[PDB]
């Protein structure tokens, strides 16, 4: 109905699900994938 688009337009979402999982700092995964490959070097 008009109420649905009427509300979901005017509000805002600053807090979702997905960026909870993502960290507020910058933690890249190269270090993570480097040790991922390093344990594979033990394999």
């Amino acid at each position: 109905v008009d109420v649905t688009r009427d509300i979901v337009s005017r509000e805002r979402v600053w807090r979702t699900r997905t960026t909870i999982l993502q960290s507020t700092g910058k933690n890249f995964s190269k270090n993570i994938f480097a040790i991922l490959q390093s344990v594979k070097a033990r394999e």
Partner: protein, 547 residues
């Protein structure tokens, strides 16, 4: 061959002038007035125009003056002094308008300079008729780009205040396209014209050159109101921050400046948004004692919801609903819908009070009047989930999919219910496949849920049977997938460290958990998983404290 007369070398100096070398111009131009050949064309005119360059104005005035004494009929001296006194408009208005301009119009009514200047004067004198009489001729009679750029620009500002914006848009574009490096008002005209007709994508691009020109208070608000910065888009958001702290210290009758301050601050620090709303509450009271619109007050209560200021957040929602009631006739603005979402926020607040009774009341008030809404339909379900799973919790959740099967949040919450039934472990492939339709994909939350239901399979005596080894490597594959699509997820890295710790690499685990440890300490899982490593080195005196 023959340096026996000066206009042989003065033609060098006009070339030098047009190469922007006014020094090389005036070097030969000194040789003009020492000799002064037969020149009714006033070598002193170009003298003054070089003195117009690089602000040698007092020499320019004297050159145009002696040009007028040799011949008052000549146009260039009078228009030169006309532009020279275009600096002061509130001071010496009349002599600019009539003596400096209308006399040039008299001695030549076809001079596109004086036509352009009477045009912009008539604009400021609010004579919007004869500006369009003579700006067309000011366009046709000139043939150089910047002049006809200014002609199109002035016809554009004429039809802009006359709201003939379709034609004036074309004039603005032609004004930009003729001579662009001259000056930036045609760029501003196009950018604000892109607010017409929804053309605002080019407004940002065109207004960027205004900041490339030079920053001003003006050129903040255009990019601030024209906020393509929605979220995680710093190319419009960092510049928004810069303009907002370009205007916050200022006050060109700042009213909404704090509103679009805090409007990006809700992603950022909340206290900045609080402060913006604080003086924004005030700023609506002094020009007229006007009550704050309830959208502001609801949002500041929403801020205090994630703060400790829960009680006055409730007071904000109450007075928000009252001000929406004070919006008695505003179904255009739909104060009723604003009250709907305000009541949603207040019921969420009553949940924070653990006043689930009144939360039920507000929720059923909204759903009995807007049953199409889903979030109220499931927060009720979440409330009964706090009581338990097979309640009408689970059924509100399933009917939330019945009203909206496209809804990924509720659909995730369906399997979230099934997390309680871990015996429904391998069955969760199906109930977390339903919206693995690629419209919903990518869903990091759900695929990490797949990883988690896949890891709870572990610590079984079947690893030696290669079954949990395959499960470990399958969870590893999920974690590699979420690794590549997101380096900065932390629950992922927790999962990698957990599965490799189940692989017996505990020296290889405290490091990867250390990363998410500085990333955020406020993950309950990593506290446990680190101390498991500690007791695996028998480091109890490092472990139980963190327990």
């Amino acid at each position: 061959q023959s340096p026996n007369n000066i206009p042989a070398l003065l033609g060098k100096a006009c070339i030098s002038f047009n190469k922007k070398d006014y020094r090389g111009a005036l070097a030969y131009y000194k040789k003009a007035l020492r000799t002064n050949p037969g020149c009714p064309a006033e070598v002193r005119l170009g003298m003054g125009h070089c003195f117009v360059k690089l602000n040698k104005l007092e020499k320019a005035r004297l050159a145009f003056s002696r040009a007028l004494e040799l011949n008052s009929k000549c146009v260039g001296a009078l228009v030169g002094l006309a532009v020279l006194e275009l600096n002061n408009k509130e001071a010496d208005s009349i002599k600019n308008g009539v003596q400096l301009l209308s006399r040039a119009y008299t001695i030549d009514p076809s001079n596109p300079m004086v036509l352009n200047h009477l045009a912009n004067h008539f604009f400021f004198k609010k004579d919007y008729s004869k500006v369009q009489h003579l700006a067309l001729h000011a366009f046709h009679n000139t043939e150089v780009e910047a002049m006809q750029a200014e002609s199109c620009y002035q016809l554009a500002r004429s039809f802009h205040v006359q709201e003939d914006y379709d034609q004036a848009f074309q004039y603005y574009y032609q004004a930009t396209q003729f001579a662009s490096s001259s000056f930036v008002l045609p760029f501003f005209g196009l950018g604000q014209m892109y607010i017409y007709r929804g053309d605002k994508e080019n407004a940002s691009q065109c207004f960027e050159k205004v900041l490339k020109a030079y920053p001003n208070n003006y050129e903040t608000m255009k990019i601030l109101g024209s906020l393509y910065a929605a979220s995680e888009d710093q190319e419009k958001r960092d510049i928004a921050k810069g303009h907002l702290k370009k205007v916050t210290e200022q006050y060109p009758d700042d009213v909404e400046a704090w509103i679009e301050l805090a409007q990006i601050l809700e992603q950022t620090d909340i206290q900045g948004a609080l402060s913006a709303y604080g003086t924004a509450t005030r700023i609506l009271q002094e020009k007229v004692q006007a009550d704050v619109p309830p959208e502001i007050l609801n949002n500041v209560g929403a801020l205090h919801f994630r703060l400790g200021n829960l009680g006055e957040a409730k007071k904000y929602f109450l007075a928000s609903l009252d001000r929406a009631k004070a919006e008695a006739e505003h179904d255009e603005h739909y104060y009723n819908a604003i009250s709907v979402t305000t009541s949603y926020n207040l019921a969420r607040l009553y949940e924070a009070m653990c006043e689930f009774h009144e939360a039920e009341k507000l929720y059923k008030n909204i759903l009995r009047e807007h049953p199409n809404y889903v979030d109220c339909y499931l927060r009720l379900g979440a409330m009964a989930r706090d009581k338990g799973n097979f309640y009408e919790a689970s059924d509100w959740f399933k009917e939330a999919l019945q009203i909206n099967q496209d809804h990924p949040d509720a659909w995730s919450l369906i399997g979230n219910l099934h997390l309680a039934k871990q015996e429904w472990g391998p069955g969760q492939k199906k109930f977390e496949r339903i919206l693995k339709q690629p419209s919903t994909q990518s869903d990091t939350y759900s695929m990490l849920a797949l990883g988690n239901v896949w890891l709870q399979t572990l610590h079984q005596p079947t690893r030696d049977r290669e079954k949990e080894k395959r499960h470990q490597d399958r969870a590893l594959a999920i974690y590699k997938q979420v690794l590549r699509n997101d380096a900065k997820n932390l629950y992922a890295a927790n999962g990698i460290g957990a599965v490799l710790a189940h692989k017996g690499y505990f020296r290889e685990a405290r490091d990867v958990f250390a990363q998410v440890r500085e990333a955020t300490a406020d993950i309950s899982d990593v506290w446990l998983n680190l101390a498991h490593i500690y007791v695996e080195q028998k480091q109890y005196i490092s472990a139980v404290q963190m327990y």
